Design an enzyme around this catalytic site. Structure first.
Site, mmCIF file in Angstrom:
data_model
loop_
_atom_site.group_PDB
_atom_site.id
_atom_site.type_symbol
_atom_site.label_atom_id
_atom_site.label_comp_id
_atom_site.label_asym_id
_atom_site.label_seq_id
_atom_site.Cartn_x
_atom_site.Cartn_y
_atom_site.Cartn_z
ATOM 1 N N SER A 1 0.833 -1.315 0.209
ATOM 2 C CA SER A 1 -0.042 -0.245 -0.093
ATOM 3 C C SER A 1 0.806 1.435 0.110
ATOM 4 O O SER A 1 2.007 1.471 0.753
ATOM 5 C CB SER A 1 -0.996 0.009 1.090
ATOM 6 N N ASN A 2 0.346 2.351 -0.873
ATOM 7 C CA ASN A 2 0.956 3.844 -0.763
ATOM 8 C C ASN A 2 0.373 4.309 0.508
ATOM 9 O O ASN A 2 1.127 5.220 0.930
ATOM 10 C CB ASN A 2 0.655 4.215 -2.289
#
Ligand SMILES: Cc1ncc(COP(=O)(O)O)c(C/N=C2\CONC2=O)c1O
Ligand SMILES: Cc1ncc(COP(=O)(O)O)c(C/N=C2\CONC2=O)c1O
Lengths: 328, 325
Positions: free
Chosen positions: A78-79
């Protein structure tokens, strides 16, 4: 001026100047259609992204409550988690991340490189779990344990996509409207549609600032049937909080994410290759690559409302390129 | 003044941020600011975009259709050049070397090297860049024989034209620093020298009381000084100025060689990440920040006043250098 109620929400300064809105002459030539890009990949904290806008509001809120720990959830890659962890580090807050492997991979770079590497650089406390079946509830359980240790935690939901979080993308619509003013009269806007805060925030903003522009969300994790209600609910809650109404229809294209969230596909990678080789712009294999694949196929299939200029919202994600290489 | 007379492309737009680092300042006992040239908007950013504005302008004015350059497999300069070529419709040919003898898969294939592939960079491997200016020239001729019109960008883009981008950066700094400072000190990594030399010229004329210190990343003081000085004099000549400032270089921070991580460097990466959410890199900025830190440690600076660190980029190499070698 109809979005003035936005002024009343406390926010931190993470961004500063408006991010660039650029014409893509080489990509436009190739697709036969004027295309622009909103460069939210160049927000200035830890390799950038759409989540910095939402964090300006959510973290402001956390500090206002005297919280000292941010707690959130996402895939190993995840960013959002990376952005949240970077903001925690910068403000001297603790950060706890509840992570899952959504694609069952054992590839070393997925497990340890890209965004996951950066979490370690940010001293993120990591909490692995089997599957985030109920992320809101699973976050809450974690928050309770963390509190028991004496911390003062603030739960940031998946992708920061609460109505408060989504205010950052209402804000983004104002930038866009201003930037377009006398310039390109836009027909369409394309954004990735995942946890929905970006889509919903843009919907509310654009309905009130550019009501003739068609907004298309390309899903990255769900069918139209599963995703629409989620964007709608947020759209209504955002509107409510700004004392506005939102009557616009939500548009979603779900043809471009198979076989699943976080799994690359050929059209995705082709879009990444196209944008890299024509404009030196870097997209990603989970979000923007699939969204750009959507845009492209919509020109192919005459899916847009007319033949006019399209704005692509670049929501970030590039660090995942390095985690996804060579394969998953 | 004369900087304007040079043709340049627009790759950057607004000035890059100049930020106070309150948590790092708190820990070091000293006011620290950072010039965020890691945030330039093309393909993950860096200091080379500033140089490329002038160099690529020049290439276009000569009607070139191909950019040719050289660097390590994990060079940021090559990745920045390749991105600029791609976006302008120019072919790009990169002459690469493995300067550290590694066979680690991520050094060989990930990070900057992966990006070259996405940019359709034509890749030329060679055993060692013993004479990069000459090697680039030979390459240029064979490329030209295939009918291309190549333009040679030297290593690091560090010609006097190239370095104009950092003279330009000094202007931005000068203007940004009136709200703040007074600076005592500026720290920048000093490699192929364009950044150092251009900042030297710009700062001598715009902030003559500030001490500029280059932390070498590949060479001893004895080897590097003549290179920065030559470039400083050529830049000054081309702007019809004089440059009488001394060049300061600290060479203690790069062992055991260019492109090899060291403990102090990685500790600097870790420090900036955990304190400020800033990402440095193992080759360039990590070592440079290690030098700034040890300068405070050893009272190496001229006084106790504010330091400006120039962030020159490099972060994508973090992913090439993991897990090792
Ligand atoms: C590059 C990128 N694009 C798009 C999105 C989607 O925007 P959203 O709809 O999420 O507002 C995310 C965040 N992804 C978050 C949401 O999904 N899972 C995550 O941890 C992202 O990192
Ligand atoms: C992050 C970063 N910092 C600093 C430098 C050095 O700047 P200079 O002093 O060279 O202007 C480079 C240069 N890239 C050059 C330096 O060495 N070889 C190269 O490919 C770089 O990528």
């Amino acid at each position: 001026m109809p979005l003035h109620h936005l002024t009343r929400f406390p926010r931190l300064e993470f961004i500063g100047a408006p991010t660039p809105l650029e014409y893509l002459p080489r990509l436009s030539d190739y697709l036969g259609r004027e295309i622009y890009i909103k460069r939210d990949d160049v927000t200035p904290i830890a390799m950038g992204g759409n989540k910095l806008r939402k964090l300006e509001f959510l973290v402001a809120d956390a500090l206002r409550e005297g919280a000292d720990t941010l707690i959130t959830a996402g895939a190993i890659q995840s960013n959002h988690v990376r952005q949240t962890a970077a903001v925690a580090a910068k403000l001297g807050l603790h950060c706890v991340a509840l992570l899952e492997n959504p694609i069952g991979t054992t590839a070393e770079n997925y497990l340890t490189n890209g965004n996951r590497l950066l979490l370690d650089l940010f001293n993120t406390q990591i909490e692995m779990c089997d599957a985030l079946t109920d992320p809101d509830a699973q976050l809450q359980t974690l928050a309770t344990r963390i509190e028991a240790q004496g911390f003062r935690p603030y739960v940031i939901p998946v992708g920061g996509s609460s109505a408060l979080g989504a205010m950052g993308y209402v804000e983004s619509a104002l930038e866009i409207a201003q930037q377009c003013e006398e310039v390109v009269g836009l027909s369409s806007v394309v954004v990735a549609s995942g946890s929905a805060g970006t889509h919903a925030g843009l919907a509310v903003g654009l309905e009130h600032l550019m009501p003739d522009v068609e907004l298309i969300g390309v899903t990255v994790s769900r069918s139209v049937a599963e995703q629409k209600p989620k964007v709608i609910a947020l759209q209504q809650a955002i509107a409510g909080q700004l004392a506005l109404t939102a009557t616009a229809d939500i548009h979603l294209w779900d043809d471009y994410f198979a076989p699943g969230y976080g799994v690359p596909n050929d059209a995705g990678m082709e879009a990444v290759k196209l944008l890299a080789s024509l404009e030196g712009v870097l997209l990603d294999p989970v979000y923007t690559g699939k969204a750009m694949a959507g845009l492209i196929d919509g020109i192919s299939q005459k899916r847009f409302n007319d033949d006019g200029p399209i704005l692509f919202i670049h929501t970030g994600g590039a660090p995942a390129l390095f985690a996804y290489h060579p394969h998953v």
